[PDB]
Amino acid sequence: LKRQEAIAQNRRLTLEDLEDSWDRGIPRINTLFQKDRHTLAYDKGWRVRTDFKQYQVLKQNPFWWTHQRHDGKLWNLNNYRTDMIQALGGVEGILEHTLFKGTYFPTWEGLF
Amino acid sequence: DEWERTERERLQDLEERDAFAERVRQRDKDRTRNVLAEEDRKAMVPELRKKSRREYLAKREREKLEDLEAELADEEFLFGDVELSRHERQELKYKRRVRDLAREYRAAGEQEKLEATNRYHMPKETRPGEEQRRWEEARLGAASLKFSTQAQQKESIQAVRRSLPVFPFREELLAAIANHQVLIIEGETGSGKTTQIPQYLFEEGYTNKGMKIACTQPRRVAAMSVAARVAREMGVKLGNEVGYSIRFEDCTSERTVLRYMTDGMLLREFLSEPDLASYSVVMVDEAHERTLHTDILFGLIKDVARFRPELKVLVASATMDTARFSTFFDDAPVFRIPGRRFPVDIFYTKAPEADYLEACVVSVLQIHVTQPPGDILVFLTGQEEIEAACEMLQDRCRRLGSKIRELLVLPIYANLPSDMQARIFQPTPPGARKVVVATNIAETSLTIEGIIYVLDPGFCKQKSYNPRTGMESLTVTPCSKASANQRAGRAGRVAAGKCFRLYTAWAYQHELEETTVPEIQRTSLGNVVLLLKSLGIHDLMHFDFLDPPPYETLLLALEQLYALGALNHLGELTTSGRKMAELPVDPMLSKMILASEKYSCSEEILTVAAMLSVNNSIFYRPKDKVVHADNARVNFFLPGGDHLVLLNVYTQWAESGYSSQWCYENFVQFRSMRRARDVREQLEGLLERVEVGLSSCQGDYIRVRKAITAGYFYHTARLTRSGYRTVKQQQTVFIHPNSSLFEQQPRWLLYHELVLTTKEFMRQVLEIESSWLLEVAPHYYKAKEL
Amino acid sequence: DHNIADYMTAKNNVVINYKDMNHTNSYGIIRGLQFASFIVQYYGLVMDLLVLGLHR
Amino acid sequence: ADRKAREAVEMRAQVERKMAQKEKEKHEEKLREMAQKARERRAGDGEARERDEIRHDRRKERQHDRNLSRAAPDKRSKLQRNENRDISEVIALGVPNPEVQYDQRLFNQSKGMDSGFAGGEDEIYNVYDQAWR
Amino acid sequence: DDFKGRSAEEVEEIKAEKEAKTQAILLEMVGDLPDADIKPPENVLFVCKLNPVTTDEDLEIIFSRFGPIRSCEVIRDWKTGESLCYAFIEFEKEEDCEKAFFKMDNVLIDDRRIHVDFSQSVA
Amino acid sequence: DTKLLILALERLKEAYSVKSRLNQSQREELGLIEQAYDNPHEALSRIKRHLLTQRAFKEVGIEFMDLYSHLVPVYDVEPLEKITDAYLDQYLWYEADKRRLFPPWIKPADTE
RNA sequence: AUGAUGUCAUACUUAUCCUGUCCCUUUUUUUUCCA
């Protein structure tokens, strides 16, 4: 619908129409806008082709069913890490178990 | 005066010209030989009806084409307005529906054709820019889940008319020039000096006695603009009484009183009628523009000014150039127009700066982020710098995300694709800012409304031609006071502007030179030397210049022309020299075209010339499609050199039927291609006069390379073990990276350019035989030197 | 194109080799070619036709 | 069988062709009717002067077109159509407006042409897609 | 079929028959001629490449040579009258048309090598 | 064709994503991919030559991937022909899908 | 019984190199019988 209206009222679809639904959808709507849409409008049969790679490479793919450039990126587990820390106790409870205090590093934000 | 010696010569010029053309047609009627029962007759009368019928088929459908077009061409400007009656009304219904019926009863047949070749056909063994909308319905198909007012116009025109800086200055300026034949009229842009003035003249009747009023411009597109504008004012059709004549496009009629043109166009009108006796007035606009054609017209028209006092000299320009203007022109009075719409706050940096391109970047950054609404204009030097700029700007856009607003970076220069030129002309999408990165192409003749900020890093890339080396180098150059003032003046045209100079008041007021060197000094003049010796003024020294070239420059010109064979050993005109001089193209090229006569490679040498006319923009080389681009280029790469490369490229384009999508597929600038085609076609229209027989080399590129030599023998280098070095001066050159021979690196080299960019360079190069050099120029090239 | 048909069909008929045993493929298909997706799905189209019939 | 099938394909093809051909011509005859009655329905205070303007304009147009083709073989094809394709020209000529486009804060927020799944590799650390803090 | 399987010659001949039929029906479509393609009189030559100074009298002179003329009609640019540099010329006999043709093709008169072909006019 | 060949070669490098100790033969295949990435027209010339004249190919090696419950054959083809087939793969699938060869019930399809 | 001719790869020499290299600003030039 918004694409029709952008043609009819002839506007440009602005960031405000698509920041709400920006990783939603299945392909994903943020694949419309990637860098290489131009040469990926030419990759057809990619799904069969990743199925059949199993007779060509000696290793076994666990994401044979999908493609990140084509299907989008369909899971986001960035909060797993945050809640894992809060459940183990927080960075302080977590580094009472380690050799951190024997390094004499003054604080743990820099650790690298 | 020398004016009278001139017109003496020039009337005899027209006499001998007409008699020459008449002689030649007689020659051709000589060369050309054209000399011219019962059942025989009743046999071929069926065959004469055969041809009558078929030529009549094409002829009848052709006449249908004529009246077909004419119905709508007629209903364009009569019907949709006026209270018109039964007869032509009914016949509009008629011609409407009837050309529909023609298109329809032919679209039927074509439908048959395409539908019946849609089908399946067992194979037989015998030994437009939408790749991003064909990938945007891949996604919407993968993601589907279904189970009077013309008088009012005139009022508005006059109402705006009245508010010019010249409308209240109307009368006294009229009376003033009624006094003085030569009146210098200083006024800045937007005053209307180009538009309102010739109107005033016409309504005051200087066109009476059938006379004309010339307006010259240095730029075609600007002339077309001006002409559209004043024809709209005058309430007539552009082309009949107000007209513009530019190369390849006449827009005049014998109703034309107000005729607009170029400076070379007016010189060429002196190639038609030395007196301009049908013109009462010549108004020369913006003469400050400093072209060779401006600096020739100045002399010629000053002669005419002394010789024709009933004739009128008007020379208007932008800047303080009135001092030398009047002084050369016997100190004509100077009528001052005050014209400057809105103010500019012009700022200087605190200091001098080290990294001025980056400084550009961070400037526009701050401006955009903090400022109120308003569009921005930024200058750079040119292409590579400018895309690097948009690189940086859009990268910081990437990083700063929704923290900022939409920054329409648009580059603009001369060679970039014309769709990409136009893209800047759209009205800005509400709420976003538009920043145009530009070159000094945006000094002049391009009108971008909305620009409220202007940034000058205070530079330019000027050509500099030293003749002692034959070298013209397009190098960096701090830009003049006139430049900075006018680059700034580009602003303000609708509102208060700002002009950020990347340099201080100190450097500005103190080390700023007023004007770019009037062109004739700095440029190479081969064709204008050719021109004034085509007009025959034997003393080329005491001629009435505005600024003479260095005697050095002229000496080089003379040696150039003599060696090439346009000059005798005393410096006058051969038939070679004249025949080449009629060509509006360089003598080297001209010698090559004449060489096609000897080598029977007419067509191929023609198309080559057509290419070198415009080359500088042939192949689009985008960063975002570098490899496919290099590829659609590397396709044509022929053995022999860039010139025959161009030959095949044009050949294949026209082969495709002058297809635009052809060049779009094959990474070629359609602009370059089609203007080059036009220059070749008008070259062919010259070709009868220059007496060239239309011949093919029959695939023998040896003739091609040899005619190339017979033209460009001067433009040659040889292998040295310390690099590629000249044939004559043994100064050291290098090959352009993008040469079709760049890795081939031939022993005996011909070029077409001689520049010294970051290192000495040469362009449009080819591999030659040193033997053709003793074939062609044993008087200039001796054997021992090869 | 009969050229491409012949390339594909002659490329399925190769010598297949393991440590020291060699034989020549003549009957089936090497599924480790890169167009073998295409060949399998085209053949499967023909057998969809034998199962459904042309009308359905 | 391949020869036989080639023949039957071609014969069926030209049969169906000829059928649709004849039908097209019948369509065309109805359009012949359309044209005759078109001019018939046609034939029966600005128009009289706009009408002298009709023949004035059209006839001097034929003058210029004939004279074009006569000075140069098709100087009509060398003037009038070639007037109207080049861009600076059109912009100076004030011709107006001679698809969806949208904001550029949208584009190029991701660059690459390969799936990030590394082609079946596993041992590399690509779980989350944002450095921790 | 058999409007195709006869030759290649008469094949394209039938297609040229067509091209005629379609161009006729087309020209009547856009509406010039009242009656459809009535055969043109064998007794007028259309003579182009002409001079605006050769008139009905002089052309009827030189084409009085081969046959009895019925007229000489240089069509006029109406409101200025300037000769259209072509003409129609009207004979009494087929033989008169032919005899004028076969000597007057591409001849130089008034320094112009005019062209004569028969009239294609249904006008 | 350069879009189709760029897709081919991206697909082929995905095998050696990690850039391990691979071997002689994988080093040589990576060399071929890079040189045909640099000069994309020597490549396409070579390809269309193969496709036009060749009908006797080298020999392929076999081995098995053990999935503990059954085995899978894995075929090893020579890198030159691997490149010509990668290209032919992409080309046939692009054209077949544009001409609509495969009707919609043939289903490892790219849409879901 | 040692000729030059070479599009021959290999061997070899100079405490001979691994640090001596790269993409154009602006723009203009008169024209001719149609058939």
Short mmCIF file of C-alpha atoms in Angstrom, two decimals, chain B residues 567-762:
data_model
loop_
_atom_site.label_atom_id
_atom_site.label_comp_id
_atom_site.label_asym_id
_atom_site.label_seq_id
_atom_site.Cartn_x
_atom_site.Cartn_y
_atom_site.Cartn_z
CA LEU B 567 51.45 27.24 -45.59
CA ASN B 568 53.90 27.82 -48.39
CA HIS B 569 57.55 28.36 -47.51
CA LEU B 570 56.65 32.06 -47.22
CA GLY B 571 53.52 31.61 -45.10
CA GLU B 572 50.48 32.02 -47.35
CA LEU B 573 47.63 29.72 -48.29
CA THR B 574 47.79 26.53 -50.28
CA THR B 575 44.63 24.96 -51.66
CA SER B 576 45.40 22.49 -48.87
CA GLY B 577 45.36 25.36 -46.38
CA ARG B 578 42.04 26.85 -47.47
CA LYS B 579 40.23 23.54 -48.02
CA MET B 580 41.23 22.56 -44.48
CA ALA B 581 40.40 26.02 -43.14
CA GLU B 582 36.76 25.79 -44.14
CA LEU B 583 36.65 22.91 -41.59
CA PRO B 584 35.68 24.11 -38.07
CA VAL B 585 38.17 21.57 -36.75
CA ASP B 586 41.89 21.43 -36.09
CA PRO B 587 44.38 21.33 -38.99
CA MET B 588 45.93 18.07 -37.81
CA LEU B 589 42.53 16.40 -38.10
CA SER B 590 42.11 18.22 -41.40
CA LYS B 591 45.32 16.77 -42.79
CA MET B 592 44.13 13.32 -41.75
CA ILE B 593 40.81 13.86 -43.52
CA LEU B 594 42.64 14.92 -46.67
CA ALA B 595 44.81 11.82 -46.24
CA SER B 596 41.67 9.70 -46.46
CA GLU B 597 41.49 11.04 -50.02
CA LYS B 598 44.83 9.44 -50.86
CA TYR B 599 44.33 6.27 -48.82
CA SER B 600 40.72 5.46 -49.84
CA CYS B 601 39.76 5.11 -46.18
CA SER B 602 37.21 7.91 -46.40
CA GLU B 603 34.40 6.57 -44.20
CA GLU B 604 36.71 5.23 -41.52
CA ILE B 605 38.78 8.39 -41.24
CA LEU B 606 35.51 10.32 -41.16
CA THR B 607 34.15 8.37 -38.21
CA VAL B 608 37.50 8.63 -36.44
CA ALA B 609 37.39 12.42 -36.76
CA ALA B 610 33.84 12.30 -35.41
CA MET B 611 35.20 10.48 -32.37
CA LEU B 612 38.15 12.74 -31.58
CA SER B 613 35.75 15.65 -31.77
CA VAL B 614 34.23 14.81 -28.38
CA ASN B 615 36.10 11.80 -26.92
CA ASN B 616 36.77 13.15 -23.44
CA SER B 617 33.51 11.60 -22.16
CA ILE B 618 33.08 8.34 -24.12
CA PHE B 619 33.09 5.58 -21.54
CA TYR B 620 31.33 5.80 -18.21
CA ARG B 621 33.58 4.24 -15.57
CA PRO B 622 31.54 4.01 -12.37
CA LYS B 623 33.09 2.81 -9.14
CA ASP B 624 30.02 0.74 -8.25
CA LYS B 625 30.24 -1.31 -11.48
CA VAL B 626 33.97 -1.08 -12.27
CA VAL B 627 34.46 -4.65 -13.45
CA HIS B 628 31.42 -5.03 -15.71
CA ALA B 629 32.33 -1.59 -17.04
CA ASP B 630 35.96 -2.40 -17.81
CA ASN B 631 34.44 -5.41 -19.51
CA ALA B 632 31.90 -3.80 -21.82
CA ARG B 633 34.91 -1.65 -22.69
CA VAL B 634 37.54 -4.40 -23.10
CA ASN B 635 35.13 -6.07 -25.52
CA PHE B 636 35.85 -3.80 -28.49
CA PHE B 637 39.60 -3.59 -27.92
CA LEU B 638 40.98 -3.89 -31.48
CA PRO B 639 44.57 -4.44 -32.60
CA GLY B 640 46.09 -1.20 -33.90
CA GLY B 641 44.93 1.37 -31.39
CA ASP B 642 42.29 3.51 -29.75
CA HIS B 643 41.22 5.23 -32.96
CA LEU B 644 40.08 2.07 -34.71
CA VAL B 645 38.64 1.05 -31.35
CA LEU B 646 36.39 4.12 -31.56
CA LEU B 647 35.73 3.26 -35.18
CA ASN B 648 34.33 -0.17 -34.36
CA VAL B 649 32.45 1.18 -31.33
CA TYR B 650 30.58 3.75 -33.40
CA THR B 651 30.16 1.16 -36.13
CA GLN B 652 28.47 -1.22 -33.72
CA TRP B 653 26.30 1.48 -32.19
CA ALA B 654 24.86 2.67 -35.51
CA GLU B 655 24.74 -1.04 -36.38
CA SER B 656 22.34 -1.41 -33.48
CA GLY B 657 20.31 1.30 -35.19
CA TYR B 658 21.43 4.28 -33.11
CA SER B 659 20.24 2.47 -30.02
CA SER B 660 20.46 4.21 -26.67
CA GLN B 661 20.04 1.00 -24.69
CA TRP B 662 22.95 -0.22 -26.77
CA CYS B 663 25.33 2.25 -25.13
CA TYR B 664 23.52 1.70 -21.85
CA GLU B 665 24.37 -1.99 -22.06
CA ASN B 666 27.88 -1.35 -23.32
CA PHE B 667 29.03 1.40 -20.97
CA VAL B 668 29.27 4.27 -23.48
CA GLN B 669 28.14 7.86 -23.05
CA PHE B 670 25.18 8.31 -25.35
CA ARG B 671 25.81 12.05 -25.40
CA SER B 672 29.30 11.64 -26.81
CA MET B 673 28.15 9.06 -29.32
CA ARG B 674 25.24 10.99 -30.78
CA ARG B 675 26.91 14.38 -30.93
CA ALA B 676 29.85 12.67 -32.61
CA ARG B 677 27.45 11.16 -35.13
CA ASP B 678 26.06 14.63 -35.80
CA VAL B 679 29.53 16.10 -36.30
CA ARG B 680 30.34 13.34 -38.77
CA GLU B 681 27.10 13.86 -40.68
CA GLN B 682 27.71 17.59 -41.04
CA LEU B 683 31.29 16.72 -41.89
CA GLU B 684 29.85 14.69 -44.76
CA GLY B 685 27.77 17.75 -45.61
CA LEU B 686 31.11 19.58 -45.88
CA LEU B 687 32.65 16.66 -47.72
CA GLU B 688 31.26 17.57 -51.14
CA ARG B 689 32.84 21.03 -50.90
CA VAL B 690 36.16 19.67 -49.67
CA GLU B 691 35.93 17.34 -52.69
CA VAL B 692 36.14 13.97 -50.91
CA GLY B 693 35.05 10.77 -52.61
CA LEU B 694 32.98 8.51 -50.39
CA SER B 695 35.20 5.45 -50.06
CA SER B 696 35.79 2.50 -47.75
CA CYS B 697 39.12 1.00 -46.78
CA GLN B 698 37.49 -2.42 -47.36
CA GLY B 699 38.79 -3.61 -44.00
CA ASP B 700 42.35 -2.43 -44.67
CA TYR B 701 43.31 -0.71 -41.44
CA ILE B 702 46.80 -0.16 -42.87
CA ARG B 703 45.41 2.72 -44.92
CA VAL B 704 43.67 3.84 -41.73
CA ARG B 705 46.84 4.01 -39.62
CA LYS B 706 48.63 5.64 -42.55
CA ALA B 707 46.07 8.44 -42.93
CA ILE B 708 46.32 8.83 -39.17
CA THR B 709 50.05 9.33 -39.69
CA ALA B 710 49.66 11.69 -42.66
CA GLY B 711 47.69 13.79 -40.20
CA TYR B 712 49.44 13.34 -36.85
CA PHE B 713 53.10 12.72 -37.75
CA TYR B 714 53.99 15.58 -35.41
CA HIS B 715 52.27 13.81 -32.54
CA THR B 716 54.72 10.95 -32.17
CA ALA B 717 57.10 9.39 -29.67
CA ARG B 718 59.57 6.54 -29.76
CA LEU B 719 60.82 3.96 -27.33
CA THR B 720 63.76 4.97 -25.20
CA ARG B 721 65.21 2.58 -22.65
CA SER B 722 64.66 5.40 -20.17
CA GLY B 723 60.93 5.43 -21.01
CA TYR B 724 58.71 6.54 -23.82
CA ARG B 725 60.07 9.80 -25.14
CA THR B 726 59.19 12.28 -27.88
CA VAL B 727 60.39 11.90 -31.44
CA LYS B 728 61.50 15.50 -31.74
CA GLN B 729 62.18 17.24 -28.43
CA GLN B 730 62.98 13.94 -26.71
CA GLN B 731 61.01 15.12 -23.71
CA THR B 732 59.74 12.26 -21.61
CA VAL B 733 56.09 11.18 -21.71
CA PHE B 734 54.05 8.33 -20.31
CA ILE B 735 51.12 6.30 -21.61
CA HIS B 736 47.66 6.86 -20.19
CA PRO B 737 46.59 3.90 -18.01
CA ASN B 738 43.37 3.45 -19.97
CA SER B 739 45.07 2.99 -23.35
CA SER B 740 44.13 0.05 -25.54
CA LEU B 741 47.91 -0.19 -25.93
CA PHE B 742 48.74 0.71 -22.32
CA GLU B 743 50.29 -2.68 -21.67
CA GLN B 744 51.16 -3.28 -25.31
CA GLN B 745 53.63 -0.37 -25.06
CA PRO B 746 54.61 -0.03 -28.75
CA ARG B 747 58.02 1.00 -30.08
CA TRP B 748 56.73 3.68 -32.46
CA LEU B 749 53.91 5.69 -30.99
CA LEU B 750 51.36 8.24 -32.12
CA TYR B 751 49.18 10.22 -29.73
CA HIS B 752 46.45 12.83 -29.84
CA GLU B 753 46.83 14.57 -26.47
CA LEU B 754 49.81 16.08 -24.69
CA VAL B 755 49.05 17.13 -21.18
CA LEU B 756 51.16 16.30 -18.13
CA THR B 757 48.67 15.38 -15.50
CA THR B 758 50.41 14.08 -12.35
CA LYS B 759 53.01 12.95 -14.88
CA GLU B 760 53.40 13.74 -18.57
CA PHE B 761 50.62 12.10 -20.55
CA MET B 762 49.25 11.54 -24.05
#
